[PDB]
């Protein structure tokens, strides 16, 4: 794993959010955006993914939360890699006292790992079957997609308490229609896959001219949504 940058809460610490960067990026660059947001009371933990051989890049190593081969809709899910990063995020979040609210967010591949974490919390276990140890208050995905949508129904249907957790967890999906890295249709299908499987508190915000990056109008919606769903 890479080097982590932590943004100290400027006011009364009430929530801790682990924010996951995109492919080839690092946590420090995201820490410098998050610390400009009008969000006191939130501690930002920005880790950096391991520089991992990426099959999409012909095996070239770079920072990645999980391995990706192929860009098609049928591509393999690196469940082992996603569970490892989800368990890593969970370990980071397990450092707070019990009264601190816990969330996870990310951009692109980091958004995918954040959304996958939310489905592990709903399922109550990782993809390998180990129990999920942390109580997530929310998750945010910017310009990403939902991994392991194929198995989401079977995982949620494993328990009535899984469906209860899925129905209450607030999820924010943001995507730009001009995105040429992660196509906008993946944002719509991730929202549809979540809603179809019991996640009844999913908000999907679209921006028509937004590409594969962030804009202040998008981040302003993130701030308002985080303020409301964290109290």
Three-state SS string across 35-63, please? CCCCCCCEEEEECCCCEEEEHHHCCEEEE
User: Which residues are bridge partners to 7 per DSSP?
Assistant: 44
- Which residue, 52, 49, 50, is CA-closest to 69? 52
Active site residue 212: yes
Query: In degrees rounded to 5, what are phi and psi of residue 191?
Result: -60, -45
Catalytic residue among 51, 186, 192, 212: 212
Rounded-to-integer distance, Cα 96 and Cα 106, Å:
20
The encoded tokens of residue 106 equal 């990310």
Q: Is 172 in contact with 203 (CB distance < 8 Å)?
A: yes
| CB 27, CB 2: distance < 8 Å | yes
Alpha helical stretches, state H, the chain: 27-34, 79-93, 109-123, 152-156, 160-168, 184-196, 216-229
CA angle 219–18–218, rounded 5-degree value = 10
DSSP structural state of residue 34: H
Give this entry's resolution in angstroms: 2.2
φ, ψ at 41 (rounded to 5°) = 75, -5
Residue that has been written with the tokens 């809709």 in this structure: 73
Domain range for 1 is 1-231
Q: Distances from the Cα of 208 to the Cαs of 22, 124, 174, 177, in angstroms?
A: 21, 36, 11, 5
What CA–CA distance (Å, rounded) separates 31 from 200?
A: 30
The SS3 assignment for 165 reads helix
Q: How far is CA 200 from the centre of its chain?
A: 17
179 is catalytic: yes
Residue with tokens 């790992």: 113
Across the strands, what pairs with 203?
172
**Annotated catalytic residue within 25, 78, 83, 179:** 179
Count of domains in the chain? Answer: 1
Contact indicator for 108, 143 with CB cutoff of 8 Å: yes
Q: Helix 79-93 vs helix 109-123: angle between axes, to the nearest 10 degrees?
A: 80
Spatial distance between the Cα atoms of 103 and 231, rounded to a whole number of angstroms: 13
CB 14, CB 41: distance < 8 Å: yes
Q: Please tell me the distance from the alpha carbon of residue 147 to that of residue 220, in angstroms, as a whole number.
A: 26
> Which helix (H) or strand (E) element contains residue 20?
strand 15-20
For the four alpha carbons of 219, 90, 138 and 13, in that order, the dihedral sign comes to negative
Distance (Å, rounded) from C-alpha 105 to C-alpha 103?
Answer: 7
Going by their DSSP bridges, the two strands 42-46 and 60-63 should be labelled as: unpaired
CA-angle at 50, arms to 40 and 121, nearest 5°: 55
CB 210 within 8 A of CB 179: yes
Distance from C-alpha of 49 to C-alpha of 88, rounded to nearest angstrom: 10
Token representation of residue 198: 């019991």
Q: Is the dihedral of CA 218, 39, 231, 197 positive or negative?
A: positive
Catalytic residue among 31, 108, 117, 137: 108
CA pair distance 201, 166, nearest whole angstrom: 8
Q: What is the DSSP letter of 11?
A: S
134: left (phi over 0), alpha (psi -120 to 50) or beta: beta
């Amino acid at each position: 794993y890479g080097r982590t940058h932590v943004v100290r809460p400027k006011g009364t610490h009430k929530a801790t959010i682990v924010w996951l960067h995109g492919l080839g990026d690092n946590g420090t660059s995201w820490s410098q955006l998050l610390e400009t947001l009008p969000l006191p009371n939130i501690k930002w933990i920005c880790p950096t993914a391991p520089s991992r051989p990426v099959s999409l890049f012909g095996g070239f190593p770079c920072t990645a939360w999980f391995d990706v081969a192929d860009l098609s809709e049928d591509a393999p899910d690196d469940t082992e890699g996603m569970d490892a990063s989800a368990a890593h995020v969970a370990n980071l979040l397990s450092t707070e006292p019990a009264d601190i609210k816990l969330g996870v967010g990310g951009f692109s591949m980091g958004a995918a790992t954040a959304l996958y974490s939310a489905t592990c919390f709903a399922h109550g276990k990782y993809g390998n079957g180990n129990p999920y140890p942390v109580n997530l208050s929310l998750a945010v995905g910017l310009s990403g997609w939902l991994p392991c949508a194929r198995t989401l129904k079977n995982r949620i249907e494993a328990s009535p308490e899984a469906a209860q957790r899925a129905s209450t967890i607030p999820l924010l999906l943001c995507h730009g229609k001009a995105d040429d890295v992660v196509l906008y249709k993946h944002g719509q299908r991730s929202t549809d896959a979540l809603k179809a499987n019991g996640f009844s508190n999913v908000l999907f915000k679209s921006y028509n001219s937004l590409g594969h990056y962030t804009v202040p109008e998008e981040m302003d919606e993130v701030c308002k949504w985080l303020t409301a769903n964290l109290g």
